[PDB]
Design a protein around this nucleic acid. Structure first.
Ligand SMILES: [Mg+2]
Ligand SMILES: [Mg+2]
Ligand SMILES: [Mg+2]
Ligand SMILES: [Mg+2]
Ligand SMILES: [Mg+2]
Ligand SMILES: [Mg+2]
Ligand SMILES: [Mg+2]
Ligand SMILES: [Mg+2]
Ligand SMILES: [Mg+2]
Ligand SMILES: [Mg+2]
Lengths: 63, 141, 82, 143, 145, 100, 206
RNA sequence: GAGCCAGCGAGUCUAACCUUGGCCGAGAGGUCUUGGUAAUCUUGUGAAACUCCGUCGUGCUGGGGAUAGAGCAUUGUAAUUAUUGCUCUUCAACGAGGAAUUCCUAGUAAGCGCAAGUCAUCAGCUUGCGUUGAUUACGUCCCUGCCCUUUGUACACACCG
RNA sequence: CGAUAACGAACGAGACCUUAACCUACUAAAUAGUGGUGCUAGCAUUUGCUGGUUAUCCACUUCUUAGAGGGACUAUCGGUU
């Protein structure tokens, strides 16, 4: 069953209606040079490692 | 006369003054040994300064700690700071500065408040609430 | 007299209050194969009170059935003799 | 090395010295014992009814050994607790005065504690001679 | 340490003072089911009867519980200090009583009847069913009946 | 002889140079002296409501008064004792002498 | 190891612990490698402590709690539901008894049982509230590793609390069994049951 | 049952306030002396939570102690619509609370007491003080308020125009 | 800060004052406190352990107290605008 570990390289900014969600740009550990934009719920800094439960998706913003 | 120094550790209101002199190696807290400090869990908290540096540096000095102020767990932290500072003060005056720095580094790596007192003080209470931040209740109807 | 709760009862099992021959050898024969022995396990598998559980726990530890780890009040932690 | 009362744990020394009291059998226990509950804030009488004057006596014996002098007013404050005032908040309430004054009188009879100058009760040299001796005895128990 | 085989004499119920005292609990807490005796008193009687207080109610010998009830029903004759009784220095008799089970309920109604019969303020407050100890009634006890 | 000067004002800067002028005029007359013991300053606090009526937000207000109290112990024959206390009396500073 | 004697006799089992390694009340901090590569750098092990009561100040900056030892954070979540506020000496006794119970019940190391337990009960994907108009809408987003550790400790301790409430079992023996049940991973632990429940709602909203 | 530790403070003379110690009493209290106009004496204000050992053993239960009945004291000219305190007995609702809604970002929330104010007596109140001490966040304009810009105006006691 | 038909200021914010945290640096103290030396008690006995004592007195200021002062100014380095 697939999960992908992903290292954050640049935090972009806060999204969502309340402001509790952050756009980040993550790099995959295996298959690097693939870049995507995802949503994070909690406190995040850079060089953190996410577990994307599926990698074929990109959010931009939350309206 | 006799080689001796005098230090103090502190906590919120607890202060513990420690007389460190040259002796046979007994470490007493309010006339009672160090193994008798009542709250059984944190007794193993007060062993850790001598447990860090090894008991060998406590053979040739004997320790008296006198403890006043604060509460139960505040008294424990003031004791451990007083003996840690007292040992590092003893090696500063009599023994060379090499022994001071290995003593200080092992303390300051493990836990910083063994040598530096915690600066967190009480915040004054304000009218309009039970606490310093809390307010009592707002009602509109 | 509306109440805005439901308030169902429970089953209230009748745990044993005095110890007799059927309980006595039952604790004697099955305190081994218990890895961890305490008051609350004895309540659940043997249907005796906390009274009986605490006193029987003291009983075994001198003669020999169970080995202690920790003898603090309100929590006794016991292991098996293998 | 000259072991003392300070060199031994408070619980077990008091328990050991109280058992020395139960065997000696010379304490002049009051007579209202097992009818009293020993504090105005307390809710029950001592569950360990057949002793607890001997427990209290051993407890009070160590206190004058530590301190300089005490009276009976100090002991009521020490042995008092929070009184649950029903639906109101709790409060510190002093202990039963008779219990402290009588065991202090009772310890005078066996010769442990004496009267003091500057008021109060002071440990006599007989008191300062046998409390060490149980302290020697009770501390080799685990050794 | 002490494990003890309980035997076939045991009782799940017992009757003292016309009340079905449940067994299977300690004797002092068990006798508090009987009205007019509470935890304090219950300890003193079983102390004055020289019974082992550690026992359960259902396993105690036949002579011991009848010895217990005598000390309850003649308390001050067996060295109870008699400020310990509930109805001491009584209004007609002058002597210290200690009502038990039905006496507590029956004698409580009777002294109410005096205050109602002389039209004392407390009695008239009881007849209306309101508070008698000077409480505020503008908000509390609102749904009493 | 053991006379003792005690100062109990609330103005600290008036109090100090009073106390300094006692101890300096002592030293021309070369007297041995316990130098000024400074007792803990005691704060008299009064916490009242601001409003005269009972309306508004419940704002309280704490007025305080600090009292500073020093004592200097002196041993001297009578002529210096008559001289020292007769001079250096500063307004709002209270001076009183006790002997032995 | 050579035992040194001095004028105050110091017990020999605490005396051993001085030079040998500076381990916990009974257990060692070696062989306590956390498995998941996301949850590392956010559980703070391999700097051992003797007692789980450190009067530390971790709340000043945003991620200082990630340097607080994970056994300390476990104690901190125990002093809750109001009546237990404060009472840290009560918390570290319970944690001591819980660690004893885990070791007796399975032979494997207790704190290693605790560290893989919280990795199981970190919710990996979670939902957020977008409005959508009248009917509140769900959006599935991903969780921080710090939030995953944060959620895990809260999920573990609430389950122990609600199960050891109005029940003969003490809180220590309750706290062990969900910590075992989560560390194996069973869906009978409350912390595992809550974790998959969040992920299914997130799976519903992708 | 045993251990056992604060800080802020108040206190009488031409008056009787804070009260140590001894004695009597289960208690609440009484009585004989003493210290204190105060860093000196009360006062280490030996506070409570807490800690260690024990009895309880999921039972509206030894949870809870409302509401009632008898006595003993204290303040006061006087206490009945019980002033307050103490003893014994009686031992109710309540099994975590709907729609709603409050306060809060570290020695902070929360728990726990103490002093002071009112005070002859009476604190479940307030003002302060210590003791024990978390979780979560380090954002945003979604809700609710307030401010600003642009804009329209036939308003200007100004939209209750 | 920057843009810039504006330059340069004032009140409010800030500064200020009080308080809490540091000072083995100064000035000092049975109304604060140690350590000794007398006088003693108990336990050991080696050369120690723990207390009591107000007229034993001599020195001390670490801890207690408040006067005068010092100290933090986000210092230094890295990153990003
Ligand atoms: Mg003495
Ligand atoms: Mg109003
Ligand atoms: Mg439980
Ligand atoms: Mg107080
Ligand atoms: Mg009734
Ligand atoms: Mg709402
Ligand atoms: Mg509170
Ligand atoms: Mg238009
Ligand atoms: Mg117009
Ligand atoms: Mg950076």
């Amino acid at each position: 069953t697939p999960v992908t570990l992903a290292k954050v390289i640049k935090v972009l900014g806060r999204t969502g209606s309340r402001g509790g969600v952050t756009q980040v740009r993550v790099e995959f550990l295996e298959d690097t040079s693939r870049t995507i934009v995802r949503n994070v719920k909690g406190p995040v800094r850079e060089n953190d490692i996410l577990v994307l439960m599926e990698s074929e998706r990109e959010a931009r913003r939350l309206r | 006369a006799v080689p001796s120094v005098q230090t103090f550790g502190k906590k919120k209101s607890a202060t513990a003054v420690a007389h460190v002199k040259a002796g046979k190696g007994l470490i007493k807290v309010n006339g009672s040994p160090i193994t008798l400090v009542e709250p059984e869990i944190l007794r193993f908290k007060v062993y850790e300064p001598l447990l860090l540096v090894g008991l060998d540096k406590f053979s040739n000095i004997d320790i008296r700690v006198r403890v006043t102020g604060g509460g139960h767990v505040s008294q424990v932290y003031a004791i451990r700071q007083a003996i840690a500072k007292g040992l590092v003060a003893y090696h500063q005056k009599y023994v060379d500065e090499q022994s001071k720095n290995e003593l200080k580094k092992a303390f300051t790596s493990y836990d910083r408040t063994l040598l530096i007192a915690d600066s967190r003080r009480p915040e004054p209470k304000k009218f309009g609430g039970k606490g310093a931040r809390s307010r009592f209740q707002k009602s509109y109807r | 007299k509306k109440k805005w709760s439901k308030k169902s009862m429970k089953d209230r099992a009748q745990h044993a209050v005095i110890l007799d021959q059927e309980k006595y050898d039952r604790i004697l024969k099955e305190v081994p194969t218990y890895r961890y022995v305490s008051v609350s396990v004895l309540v659940d598998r043997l249907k005796i009170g906390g009274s009986l559980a605490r006193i029987a726990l003291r009983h075994l530890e001198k003669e020999g059935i169970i080995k202690p780890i920790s003898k603090h009040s309100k929590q006794a932690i016991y292991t098996r003799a293998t | 090395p000259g072991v003392s009362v300070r060199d031994v744990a408070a619980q077990d020394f008091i328990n050991a010295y109280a058992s020395f009291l139960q065997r000696q059998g010379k304490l002049e226990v009051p007579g209202y014992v097992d009818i009293v509950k020993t504090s105005s804030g307390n809710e029950m009488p001592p569950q360990d009814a057949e002793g607890w004057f001997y427990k209290r006596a051993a407890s009070v014996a160590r206190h004058i050994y530590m301190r300089k002098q005490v009276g009976v007013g100090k002991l009521n404050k020490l042995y008092g607790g929070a009184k649950s005032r029903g639906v109101r908040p709790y409060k510190h309430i002093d202990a039963s005065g008779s219990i402290n004054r009588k065991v202090l009188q009772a310890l005078e009879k066996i010769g442990i504690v004496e009267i003091s100058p500057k008021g109060g009760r002071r440990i006599s040299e007989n008191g300062q001679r046998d409390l060490d001796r149980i302290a020697a005895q009770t501390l080799e128990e685990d050794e | 340490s002490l494990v003890v085989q309980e035997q076939g004499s045991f009782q799940h119920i017992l009757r003292l003072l016309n009340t079905n005292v449940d067994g299977n609990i300690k004797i002092v807490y068990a006798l508090t089911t009987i009205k007019g005796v509470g935890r304090r008193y219950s300890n003193l009687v079983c102390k004055k009867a020289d019974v082992d207080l550690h026992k359960r109610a259902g396993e105690l010998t036949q002579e011991e519980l009848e010895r217990i009830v005598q000390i309850m029903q003649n308390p001050t004759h067996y060295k109870i200090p008699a400020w310990f009784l509930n109805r001491q220095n009584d209004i007609t008799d002058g002597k210290d009583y200690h009502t038990l089970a039905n006496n507590v309920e029956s004698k409580l109604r009777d002294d109410l009847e005096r205050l109602k019969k002389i039209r004392a303020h407390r009695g008239i407050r009881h007849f209306w069913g309101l508070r008698v100890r000077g409480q505020h009634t503008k908000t509390t006890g609102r749904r009493r009946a | 002889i053991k006379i003792r000067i005690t100062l109990t004002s609330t103005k600290v800067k008036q109090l100090e140079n009073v106390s300094s002028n006692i101890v300096k005029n002592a030293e021309q007359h070369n007297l041995v002296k316990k130098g000024p013991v400074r007792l803990p300053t005691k704060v008299l606090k009064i916490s009242t409501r601001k409003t005269p009526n009972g309306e508004g937000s419940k704002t309280w207000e704490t007025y305080e008064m600090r009292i500073h109290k020093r004592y200097i112990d002196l041993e001297a024959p009578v002529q210096i004792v008559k001289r020292i206390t007769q001079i250096t009396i500063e307004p709002g500073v209270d001076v009183e002498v006790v002997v032995a | 190891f050579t035992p040194v004697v001095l004028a105050t006799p110091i017990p020999e089992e605490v005396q051993q612990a001085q030079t040998e390694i500076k381990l916990f009340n009974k257990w060692s901090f070696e062989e306590v490698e956390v498995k998941d590569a996301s949850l590392v750098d956010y559980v703070q092990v391999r700097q051992p402590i003797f007692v789980a009561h450190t009067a530390g100040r971790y709340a000043n900056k945003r991620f200082r709690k990630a340097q607080c030892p994970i056994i300390e954070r476990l104690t901190n979540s125990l002093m809750m539901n109001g009546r237990n506020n404060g009472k840290k000496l009560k918390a570290v006794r319970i944690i001591k008894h819980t660690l004893d119970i885990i070791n007796v019940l399975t032979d494997q190391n207790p704190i290693q049982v605790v560290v893989d337990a919280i990795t199981n009960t970190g919710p990996r994907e979670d939902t957020t509230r977008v409005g959508g108009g009248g009917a509140a809408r769900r959006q599935a987003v991903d969780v921080s590793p710090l939030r995953r550790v944060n959620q895990a400790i809260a999920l573990l301790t609430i389950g122990a609390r609600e199960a050891a409430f109005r029940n003969i079992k003490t809180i220590a023996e309750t706290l062990a069994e969900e910590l075992i049940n989560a560390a194996k991973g069973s869906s009978t632990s409350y912390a595992i049951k809550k974790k998959d429940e969040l992920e299914r709602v997130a799976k519903s909203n992708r």
